[PDB]
Every structure is written in C-alpha cells, then in structure tokens.
Tab-separated table of C-alpha atoms in Angstrom:
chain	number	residue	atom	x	y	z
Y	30	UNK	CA	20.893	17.234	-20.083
Y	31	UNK	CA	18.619	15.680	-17.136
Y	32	UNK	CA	14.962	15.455	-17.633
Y	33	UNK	CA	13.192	16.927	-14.957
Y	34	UNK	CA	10.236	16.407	-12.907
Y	35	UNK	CA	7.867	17.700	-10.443
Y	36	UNK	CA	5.535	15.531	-8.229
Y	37	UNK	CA	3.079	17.362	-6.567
Y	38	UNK	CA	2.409	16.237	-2.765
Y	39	UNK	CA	-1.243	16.578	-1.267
Y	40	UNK	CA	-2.298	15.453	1.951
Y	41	UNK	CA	-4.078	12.297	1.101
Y	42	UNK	CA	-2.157	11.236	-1.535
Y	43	UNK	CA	-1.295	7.343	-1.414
Y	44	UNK	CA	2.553	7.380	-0.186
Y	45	UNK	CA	3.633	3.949	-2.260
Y	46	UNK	CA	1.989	6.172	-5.236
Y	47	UNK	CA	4.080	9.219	-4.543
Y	48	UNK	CA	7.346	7.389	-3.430
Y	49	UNK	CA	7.737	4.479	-5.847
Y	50	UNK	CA	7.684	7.327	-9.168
Y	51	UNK	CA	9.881	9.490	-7.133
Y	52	UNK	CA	12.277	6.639	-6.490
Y	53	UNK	CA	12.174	5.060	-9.738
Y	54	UNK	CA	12.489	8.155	-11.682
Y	55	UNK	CA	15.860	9.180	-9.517
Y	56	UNK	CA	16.894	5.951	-10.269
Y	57	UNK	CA	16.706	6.632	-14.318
Y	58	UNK	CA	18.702	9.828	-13.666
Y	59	UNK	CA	15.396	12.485	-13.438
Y	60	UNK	CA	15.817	15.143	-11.482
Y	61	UNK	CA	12.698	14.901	-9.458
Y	62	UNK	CA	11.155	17.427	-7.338
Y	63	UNK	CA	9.099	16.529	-4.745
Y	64	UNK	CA	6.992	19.476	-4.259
Y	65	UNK	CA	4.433	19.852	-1.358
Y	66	UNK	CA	0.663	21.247	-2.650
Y	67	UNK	CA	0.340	22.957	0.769
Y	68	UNK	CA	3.668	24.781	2.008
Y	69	UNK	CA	6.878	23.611	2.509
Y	70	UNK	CA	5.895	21.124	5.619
Y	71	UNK	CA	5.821	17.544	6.417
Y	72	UNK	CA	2.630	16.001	4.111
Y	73	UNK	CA	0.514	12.975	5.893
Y	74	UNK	CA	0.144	10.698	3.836
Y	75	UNK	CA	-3.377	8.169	3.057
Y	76	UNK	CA	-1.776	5.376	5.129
Y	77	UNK	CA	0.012	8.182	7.632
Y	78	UNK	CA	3.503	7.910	5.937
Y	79	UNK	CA	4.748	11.583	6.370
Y	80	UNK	CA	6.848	12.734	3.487
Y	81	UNK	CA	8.840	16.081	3.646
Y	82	UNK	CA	9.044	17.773	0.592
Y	83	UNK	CA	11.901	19.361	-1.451
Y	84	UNK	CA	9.663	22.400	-1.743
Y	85	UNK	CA	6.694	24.170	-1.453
Y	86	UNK	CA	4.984	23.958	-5.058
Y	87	UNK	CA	5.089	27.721	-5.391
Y	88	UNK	CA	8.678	27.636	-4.995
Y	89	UNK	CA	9.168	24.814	-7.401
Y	90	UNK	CA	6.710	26.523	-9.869
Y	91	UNK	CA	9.746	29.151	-10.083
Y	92	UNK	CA	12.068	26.388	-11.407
Y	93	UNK	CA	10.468	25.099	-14.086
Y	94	UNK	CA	9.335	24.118	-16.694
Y	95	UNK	CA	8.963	20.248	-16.032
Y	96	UNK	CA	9.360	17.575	-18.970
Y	97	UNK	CA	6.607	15.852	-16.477
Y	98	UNK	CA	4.488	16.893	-13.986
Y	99	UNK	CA	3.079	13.537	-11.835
Y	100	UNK	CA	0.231	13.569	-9.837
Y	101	UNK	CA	-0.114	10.902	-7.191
Y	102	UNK	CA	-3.731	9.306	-6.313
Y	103	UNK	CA	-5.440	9.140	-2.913
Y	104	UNK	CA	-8.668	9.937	-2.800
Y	105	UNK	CA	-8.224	12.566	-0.666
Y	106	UNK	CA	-4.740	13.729	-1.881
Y	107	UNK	CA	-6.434	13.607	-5.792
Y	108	UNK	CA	-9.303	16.311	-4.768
Y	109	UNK	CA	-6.661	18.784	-2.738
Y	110	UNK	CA	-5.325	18.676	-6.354
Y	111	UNK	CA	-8.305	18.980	-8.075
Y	112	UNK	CA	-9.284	22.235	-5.598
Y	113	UNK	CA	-5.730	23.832	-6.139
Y	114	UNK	CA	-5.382	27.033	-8.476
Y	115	UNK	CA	-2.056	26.777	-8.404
Y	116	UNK	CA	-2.224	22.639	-9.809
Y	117	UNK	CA	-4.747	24.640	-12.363
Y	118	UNK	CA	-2.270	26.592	-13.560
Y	119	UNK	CA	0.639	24.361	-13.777
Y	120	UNK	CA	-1.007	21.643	-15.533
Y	121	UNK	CA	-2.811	24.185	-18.001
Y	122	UNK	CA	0.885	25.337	-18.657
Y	123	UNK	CA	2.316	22.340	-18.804
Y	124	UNK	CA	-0.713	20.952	-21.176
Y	125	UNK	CA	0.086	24.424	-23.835
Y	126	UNK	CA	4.118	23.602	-23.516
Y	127	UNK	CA	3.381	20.231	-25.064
Y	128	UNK	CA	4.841	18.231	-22.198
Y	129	UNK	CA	3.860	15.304	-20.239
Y	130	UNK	CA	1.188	14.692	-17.222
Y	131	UNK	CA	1.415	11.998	-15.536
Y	132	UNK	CA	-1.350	10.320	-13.590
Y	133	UNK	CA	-2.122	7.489	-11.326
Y	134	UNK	CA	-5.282	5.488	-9.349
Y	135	UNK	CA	-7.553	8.436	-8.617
Y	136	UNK	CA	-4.710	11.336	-9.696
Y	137	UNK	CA	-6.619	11.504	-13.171
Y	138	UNK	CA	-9.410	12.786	-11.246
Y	139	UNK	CA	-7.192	16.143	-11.309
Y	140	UNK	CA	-7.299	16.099	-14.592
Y	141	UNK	CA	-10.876	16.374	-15.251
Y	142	UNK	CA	-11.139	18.750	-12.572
Y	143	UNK	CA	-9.133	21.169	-14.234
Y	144	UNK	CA	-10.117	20.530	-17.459
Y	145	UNK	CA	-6.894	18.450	-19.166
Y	146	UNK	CA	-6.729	16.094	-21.874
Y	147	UNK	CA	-9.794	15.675	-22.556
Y	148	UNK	CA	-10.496	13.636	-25.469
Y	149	UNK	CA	-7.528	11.021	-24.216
Y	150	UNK	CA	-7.489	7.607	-23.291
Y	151	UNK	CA	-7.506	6.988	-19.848
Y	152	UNK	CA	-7.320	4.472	-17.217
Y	153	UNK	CA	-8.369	5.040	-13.243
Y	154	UNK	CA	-8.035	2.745	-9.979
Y	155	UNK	CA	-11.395	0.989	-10.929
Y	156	UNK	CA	-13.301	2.648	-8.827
Y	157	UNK	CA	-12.559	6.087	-9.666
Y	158	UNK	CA	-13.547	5.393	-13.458
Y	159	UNK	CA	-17.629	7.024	-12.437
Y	160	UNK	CA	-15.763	10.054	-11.235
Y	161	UNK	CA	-13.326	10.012	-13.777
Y	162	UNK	CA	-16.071	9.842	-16.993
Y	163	UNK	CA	-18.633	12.177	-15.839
Y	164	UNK	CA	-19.393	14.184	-18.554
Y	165	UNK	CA	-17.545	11.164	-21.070
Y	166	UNK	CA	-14.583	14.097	-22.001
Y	167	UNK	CA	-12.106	10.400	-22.086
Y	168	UNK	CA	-12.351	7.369	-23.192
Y	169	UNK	CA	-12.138	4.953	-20.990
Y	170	UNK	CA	-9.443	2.148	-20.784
Y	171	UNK	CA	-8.710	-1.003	-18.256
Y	172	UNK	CA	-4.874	-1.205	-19.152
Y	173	UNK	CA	-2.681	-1.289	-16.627
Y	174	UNK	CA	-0.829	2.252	-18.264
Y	175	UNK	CA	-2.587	3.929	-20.865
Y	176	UNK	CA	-0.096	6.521	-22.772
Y	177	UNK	CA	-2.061	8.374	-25.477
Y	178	UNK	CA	0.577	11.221	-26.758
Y	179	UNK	CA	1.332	13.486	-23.343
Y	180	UNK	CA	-1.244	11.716	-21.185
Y	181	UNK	CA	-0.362	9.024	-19.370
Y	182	UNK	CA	-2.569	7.110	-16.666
Y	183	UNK	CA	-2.447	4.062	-14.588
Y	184	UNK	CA	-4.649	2.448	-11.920
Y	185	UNK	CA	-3.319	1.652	-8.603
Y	186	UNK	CA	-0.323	1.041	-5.958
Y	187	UNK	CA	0.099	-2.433	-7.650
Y	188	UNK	CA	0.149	-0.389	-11.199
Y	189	UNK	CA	2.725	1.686	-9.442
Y	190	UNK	CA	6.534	0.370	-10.897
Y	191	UNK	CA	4.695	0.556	-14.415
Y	192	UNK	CA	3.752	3.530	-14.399
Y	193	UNK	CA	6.898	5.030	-13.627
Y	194	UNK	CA	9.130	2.709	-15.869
Y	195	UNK	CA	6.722	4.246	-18.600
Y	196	UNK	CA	7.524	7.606	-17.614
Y	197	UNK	CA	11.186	6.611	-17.672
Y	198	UNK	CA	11.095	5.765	-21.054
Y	199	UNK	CA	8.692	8.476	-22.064
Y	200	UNK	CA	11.611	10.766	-21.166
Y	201	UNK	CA	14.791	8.718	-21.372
Y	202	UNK	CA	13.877	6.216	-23.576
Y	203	UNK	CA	13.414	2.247	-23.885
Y	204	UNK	CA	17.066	1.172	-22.728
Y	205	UNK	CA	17.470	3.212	-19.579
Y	206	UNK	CA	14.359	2.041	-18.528
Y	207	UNK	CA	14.537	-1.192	-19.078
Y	208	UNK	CA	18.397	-1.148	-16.992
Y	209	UNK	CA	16.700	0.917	-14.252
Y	210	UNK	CA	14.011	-2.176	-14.071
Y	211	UNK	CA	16.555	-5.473	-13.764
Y	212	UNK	CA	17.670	-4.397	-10.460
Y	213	UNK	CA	13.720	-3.801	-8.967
Y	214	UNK	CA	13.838	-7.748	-9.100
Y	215	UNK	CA	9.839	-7.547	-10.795
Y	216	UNK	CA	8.347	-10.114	-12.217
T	14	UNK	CA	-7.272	-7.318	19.315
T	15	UNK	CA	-4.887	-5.990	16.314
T	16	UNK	CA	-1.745	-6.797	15.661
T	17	UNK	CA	1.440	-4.728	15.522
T	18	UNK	CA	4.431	-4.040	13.704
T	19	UNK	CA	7.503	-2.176	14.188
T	20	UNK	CA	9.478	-1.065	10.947
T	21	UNK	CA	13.288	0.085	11.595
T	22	UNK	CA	14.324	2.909	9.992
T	23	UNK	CA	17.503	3.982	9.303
T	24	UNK	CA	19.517	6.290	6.632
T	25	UNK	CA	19.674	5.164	3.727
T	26	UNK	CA	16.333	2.935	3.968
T	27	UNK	CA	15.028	1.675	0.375
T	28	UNK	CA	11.909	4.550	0.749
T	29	UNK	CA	10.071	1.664	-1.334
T	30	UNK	CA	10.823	-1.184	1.022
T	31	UNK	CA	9.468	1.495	3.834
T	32	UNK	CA	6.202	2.811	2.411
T	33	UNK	CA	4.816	-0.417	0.437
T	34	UNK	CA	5.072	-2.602	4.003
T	35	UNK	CA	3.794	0.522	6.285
T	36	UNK	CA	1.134	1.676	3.848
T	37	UNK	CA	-0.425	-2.339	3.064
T	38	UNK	CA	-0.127	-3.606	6.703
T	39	UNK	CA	-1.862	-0.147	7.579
T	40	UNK	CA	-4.724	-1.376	4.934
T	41	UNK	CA	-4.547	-4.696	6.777
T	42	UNK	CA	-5.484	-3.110	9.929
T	43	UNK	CA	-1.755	-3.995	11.857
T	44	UNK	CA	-1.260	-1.192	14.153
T	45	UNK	CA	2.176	-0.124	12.562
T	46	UNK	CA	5.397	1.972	14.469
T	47	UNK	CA	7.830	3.835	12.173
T	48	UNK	CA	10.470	3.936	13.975
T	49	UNK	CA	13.559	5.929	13.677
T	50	UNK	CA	17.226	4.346	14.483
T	51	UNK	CA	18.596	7.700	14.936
T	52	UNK	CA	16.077	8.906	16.781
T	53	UNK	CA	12.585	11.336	16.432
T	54	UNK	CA	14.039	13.277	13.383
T	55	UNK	CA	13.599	12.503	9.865
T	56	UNK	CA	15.240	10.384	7.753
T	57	UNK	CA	16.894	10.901	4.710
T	58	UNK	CA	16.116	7.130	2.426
T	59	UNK	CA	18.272	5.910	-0.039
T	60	UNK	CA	16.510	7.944	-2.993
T	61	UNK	CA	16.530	11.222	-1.073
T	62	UNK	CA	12.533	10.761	-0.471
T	63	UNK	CA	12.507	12.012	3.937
T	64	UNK	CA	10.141	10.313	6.134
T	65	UNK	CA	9.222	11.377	9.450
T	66	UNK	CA	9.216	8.356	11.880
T	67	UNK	CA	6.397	8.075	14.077
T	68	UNK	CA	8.889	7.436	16.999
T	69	UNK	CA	12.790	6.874	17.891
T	70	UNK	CA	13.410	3.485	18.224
T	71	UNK	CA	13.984	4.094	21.943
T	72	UNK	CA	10.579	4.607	22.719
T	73	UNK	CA	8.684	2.230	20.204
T	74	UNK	CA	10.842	-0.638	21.621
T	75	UNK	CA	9.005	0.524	25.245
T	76	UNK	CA	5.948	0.094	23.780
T	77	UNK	CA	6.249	-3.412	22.189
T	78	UNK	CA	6.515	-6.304	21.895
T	79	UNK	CA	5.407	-6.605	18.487
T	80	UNK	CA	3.662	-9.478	16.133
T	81	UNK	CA	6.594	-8.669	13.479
T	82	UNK	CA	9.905	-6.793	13.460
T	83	UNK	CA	10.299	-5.341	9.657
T	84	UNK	CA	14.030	-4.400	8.731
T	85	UNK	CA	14.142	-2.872	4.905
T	86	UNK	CA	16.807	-2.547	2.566
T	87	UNK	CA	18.617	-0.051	0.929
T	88	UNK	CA	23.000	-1.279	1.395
T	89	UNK	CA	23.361	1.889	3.608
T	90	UNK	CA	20.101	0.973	6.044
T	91	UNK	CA	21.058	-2.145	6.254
T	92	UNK	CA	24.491	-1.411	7.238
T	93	UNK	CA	23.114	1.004	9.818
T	94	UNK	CA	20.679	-1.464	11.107
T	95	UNK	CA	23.891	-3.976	10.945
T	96	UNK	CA	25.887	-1.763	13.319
T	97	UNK	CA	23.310	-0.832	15.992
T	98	UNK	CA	23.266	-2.403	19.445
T	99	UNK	CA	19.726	-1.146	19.631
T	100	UNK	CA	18.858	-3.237	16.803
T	101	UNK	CA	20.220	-6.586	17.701
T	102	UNK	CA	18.700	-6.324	21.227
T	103	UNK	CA	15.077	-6.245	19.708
T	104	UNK	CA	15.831	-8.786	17.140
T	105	UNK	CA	17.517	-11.149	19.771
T	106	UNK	CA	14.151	-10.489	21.906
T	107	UNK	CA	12.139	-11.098	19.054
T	108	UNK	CA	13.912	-14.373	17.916
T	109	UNK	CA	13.464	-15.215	22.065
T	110	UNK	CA	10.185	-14.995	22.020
T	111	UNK	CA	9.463	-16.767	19.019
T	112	UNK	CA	7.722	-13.484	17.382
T	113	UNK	CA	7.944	-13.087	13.212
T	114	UNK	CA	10.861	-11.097	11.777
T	115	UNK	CA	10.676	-9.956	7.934
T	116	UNK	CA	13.519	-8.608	6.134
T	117	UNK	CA	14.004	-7.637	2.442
T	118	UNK	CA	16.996	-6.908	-0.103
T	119	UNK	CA	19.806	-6.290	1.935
T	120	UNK	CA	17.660	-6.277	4.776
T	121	UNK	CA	18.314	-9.720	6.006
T	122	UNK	CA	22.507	-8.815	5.746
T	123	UNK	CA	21.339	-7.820	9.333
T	124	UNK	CA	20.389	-10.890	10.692
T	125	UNK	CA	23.556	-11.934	9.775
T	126	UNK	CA	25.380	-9.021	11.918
T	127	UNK	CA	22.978	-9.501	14.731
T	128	UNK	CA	23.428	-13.807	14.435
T	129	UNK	CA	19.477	-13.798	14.014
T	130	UNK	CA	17.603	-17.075	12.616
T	131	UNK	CA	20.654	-19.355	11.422
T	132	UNK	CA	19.586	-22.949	9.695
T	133	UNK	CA	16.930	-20.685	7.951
T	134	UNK	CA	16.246	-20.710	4.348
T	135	UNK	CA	16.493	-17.170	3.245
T	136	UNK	CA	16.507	-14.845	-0.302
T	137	UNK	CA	18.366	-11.636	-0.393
T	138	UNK	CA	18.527	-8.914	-3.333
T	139	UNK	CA	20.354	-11.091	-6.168
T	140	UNK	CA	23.449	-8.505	-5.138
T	141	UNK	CA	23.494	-9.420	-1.395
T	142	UNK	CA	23.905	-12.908	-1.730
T	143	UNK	CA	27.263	-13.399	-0.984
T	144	UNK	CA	27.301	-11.101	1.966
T	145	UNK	CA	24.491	-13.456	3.421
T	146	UNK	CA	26.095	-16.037	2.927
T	147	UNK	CA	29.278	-15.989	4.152
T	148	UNK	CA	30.290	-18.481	6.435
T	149	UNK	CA	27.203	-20.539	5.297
T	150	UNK	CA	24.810	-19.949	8.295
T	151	UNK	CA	21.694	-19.492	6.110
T	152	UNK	CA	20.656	-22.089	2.959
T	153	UNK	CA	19.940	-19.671	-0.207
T	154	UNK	CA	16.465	-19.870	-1.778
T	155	UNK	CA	15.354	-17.589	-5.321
T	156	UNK	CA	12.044	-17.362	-4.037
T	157	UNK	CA	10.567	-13.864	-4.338
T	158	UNK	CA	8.979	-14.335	-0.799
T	159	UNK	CA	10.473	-16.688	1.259
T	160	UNK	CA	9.338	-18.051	4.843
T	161	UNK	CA	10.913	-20.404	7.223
T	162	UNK	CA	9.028	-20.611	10.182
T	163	UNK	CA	9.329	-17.181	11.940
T	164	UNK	CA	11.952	-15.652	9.617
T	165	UNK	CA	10.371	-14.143	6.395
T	166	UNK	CA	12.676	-12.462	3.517
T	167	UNK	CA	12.407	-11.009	0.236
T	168	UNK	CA	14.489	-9.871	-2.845
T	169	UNK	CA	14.150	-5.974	-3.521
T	170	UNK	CA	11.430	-3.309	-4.722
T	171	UNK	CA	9.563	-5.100	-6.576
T	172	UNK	CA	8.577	-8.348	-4.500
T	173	UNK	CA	7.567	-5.031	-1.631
T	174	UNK	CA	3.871	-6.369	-2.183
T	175	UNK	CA	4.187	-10.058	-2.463
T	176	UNK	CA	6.107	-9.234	1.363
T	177	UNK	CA	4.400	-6.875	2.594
T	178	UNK	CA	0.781	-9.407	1.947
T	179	UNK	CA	3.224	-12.382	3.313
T	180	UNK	CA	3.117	-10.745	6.518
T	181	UNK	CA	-0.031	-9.502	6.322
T	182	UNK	CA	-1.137	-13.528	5.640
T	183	UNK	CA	1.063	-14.536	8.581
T	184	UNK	CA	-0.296	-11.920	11.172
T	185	UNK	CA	-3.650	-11.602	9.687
T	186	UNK	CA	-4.416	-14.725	7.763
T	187	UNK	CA	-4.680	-15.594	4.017
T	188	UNK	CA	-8.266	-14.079	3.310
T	189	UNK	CA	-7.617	-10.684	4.868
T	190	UNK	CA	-4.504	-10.460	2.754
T	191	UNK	CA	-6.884	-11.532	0.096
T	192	UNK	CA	-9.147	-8.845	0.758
T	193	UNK	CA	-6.315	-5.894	1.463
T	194	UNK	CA	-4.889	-7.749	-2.208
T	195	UNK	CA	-7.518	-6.884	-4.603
T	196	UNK	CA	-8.243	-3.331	-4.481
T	197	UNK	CA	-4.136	-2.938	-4.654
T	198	UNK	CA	-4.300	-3.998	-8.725
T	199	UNK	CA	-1.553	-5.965	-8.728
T	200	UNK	CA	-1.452	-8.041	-11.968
C-alpha cells in the first residue's frame, strides 16, 4: 500500500520548498496531499508563485492519518503555521501516532511553536537557528538533513531535493529513492 | 531599471523547472511574468502541483519585450510549447532581437519545433537527446548549464538552480547571482 502524505500550504511559504517535496515525493509513488492552511483557495506564495491546493487542511484532516506530515519554510508561511490550532493539533497527533514530521528552512520554527520534538536534533535555514533554539528544547545541527527517529529537518531551497529524497526513503526505503533521484540529473 | 522575464507555461510544465527559475530570478530582483499558454486559468504541471499564471500569454507578450524568454520542461509542456504558433512567434522575435532565451530538460525540444538558435551548443535532459538532435542542427554538450551566446540550456530538476543563477548572472551579473546564491544553501 501507498504511503501517504500531507503538506500543509501557508501563505508565505517558499514555493520551491513546497513544490520540489510535493514533486519528488509523487515521483516515489506517495500519495501527497497538498493541503491549503487557510481554505480551499489559491495560496501566494514568498516569491508570488500561487499554488492551488488539493484541499482545505480541514478537509484533508478527515483523510488521514499521514505516514508524514511536511511543513514548508517561508518566514511568513512558517509563523501562519506556527499560529494555526488546527497545525497544533495535527502535528500533536501525528507526534502520539509515532509518525514522521517533516521540516524545512524556517518550517522547524512550527515545531517549537507547538511544542514538537523537543529534545531532537535539528537543523534550520541558518538564520532561523536564534528562533529555532530559544529556550535550547533541540540541539542544534548544521547538516544539510538532520533525521533523528521521526524528526527530520533541513535548511533551505538549495537543501530542498535532499530533504525530500530522505523522506522518500524514510517511507519507501533506500532503493526507490535512490531510482526516483537518477532521473533529477543532481550532482 | 530591472530586468524582465517571461516564463511559458503550459500543461504538463516540470512544476520544479517553473517555481525554482520564477522564485530565484524574483530574489534577483527580475521583474518576472508567469504566463499561461492556454490562457488566464490554471495549470495543471506535470506532478499534478496547479499554478495560477500571472497572465495568458496573449497579454504578457503585449507587455514585453523581455531580457529572457524561459521555456521549462516536463515531455508534455514541451510538446505543448512545441505545437503553439504563439510560442514560436515570441521566440522568433526574441532570437530577432538578439534577446536571451533559456530552456531546460525537454525544454529546448522546442527550439527545435520553432527552428530557434541552430549552430548552438546545447544540453537537454539525458532522455531528450535524441529528439534534439535529430537532423543535427544543434552540437550536444553534458554540461549541467550550458550557454552559447544568447541561447542558455540545462538538463532537468536538479541543475533548476545552477539555471535559474545562469540567468540571473547573464541579466544581472555574476555578483548579484552571488549574492541571491548564498542565502539559497546550495552545497
């Protein structure tokens, strides 16, 4: 059976962050919801790439449970997630199932927010690591992915391909992801 | 006074080869047209992620000319940019005026179509190759980024940065790529 995934879309968020998981991760054969934080309408992006969701996140709530839940950076798009109830909820829920969260540039923001992982490595876009280790709940980590058990981080657009391919074989293992890579032509 | 960029989309775009150009020539401050081959609507990319365009095609060619035409790939886009009249009247203007055109994947199986930039060294997607080449107009290169003169390729997904700053150099000049480069994390 398909692994499945939701991606939650906030205006803000940094569109190569949101569409190169989303793309990547259909790619490897996830079923990947793209779910938008506000409603079901067009989301502007941090660079003003509009992206219409699959569904509004309350409606994708309904069709869980996720074996990941990915949340894009963007400064902006990373505190409409940290403000959210409902991304409260879902990632509390998704933290208690023992399944994966996924997080990228200023995305793990979220996660501190709402009170996740905490005692985890993590990595940040550099300068989102002050925000990021108020308090010092993480550890603090300057790999390009950081994976410790079901929290996984990485920094930046540029960190973007592998981040996903490490979601990719977080949920469909080393061999899929590694085929799904060859034709991306990376280096 | 800024440059600007027009970026051709059509179904069945590589979403990838859409957002990573729009999103770091955005950072580069190029004033940067989405534009829709169909028309106003949205657009359904090769990996089912829908962008909104900021305009048909029919009105952003009123408003140009622009610094660089940007064709991505996807087979399906490309075929669709391949086909349209639309698309080989701005790329003959383009080529006419001696303006930059950037194409990546199966992107540059357009130029082909539309008899754009022959004698040029080009790269492809290792997979469109041989539809590039046939007949022999166009001298292969395995460059990642390739440029000759006023006709800039690139291979697929992942060489969507190394591109997408190519341009940015050419427009913009090598330290502003520089400077739109670092807070990116690329390795």
């Amino acid at each position: 059976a398909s692994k499945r995934a939701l991606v939650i879309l906030a205006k803000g968020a940094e569109e190569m962050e949101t569409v190169i998981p989303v793309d990547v991760m259909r790619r490897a054969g996830i079923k990947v919801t793209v779910a938008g934080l506000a409603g079901k309408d067009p989301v502007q992006c941090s660079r003003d790439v509009v992206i219409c969701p699959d569904a509004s996140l309350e409606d994708a709530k309904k069709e869980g449970p996720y074996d990941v839940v990915v949340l894009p950076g963007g400064n902006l798009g990373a505190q409409n997630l940290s403000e959210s109830a409902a991304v409260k909820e879902i990632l509390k829920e998704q933290e208690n199932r023992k399944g994966l969260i996924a997080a990228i540039c200023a995305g793990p923001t979220a996660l501190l927010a709402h009170e996740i992982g905490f005692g985890s490595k993590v990595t940040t876009h550099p300068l989102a690591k002050d925000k990021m280790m108020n308090g010092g709940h993480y550890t603090y980590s300057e790999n390009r992915v950081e994976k410790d058990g079901l929290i996984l981080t990485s920094r930046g657009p540029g960190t973007s391909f592998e981040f996903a391919l490490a979601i990719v074989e977080a949920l469909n293992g080393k061999e899929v992801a590694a085929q799904v890579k060859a034709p991306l032509v990376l280096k």
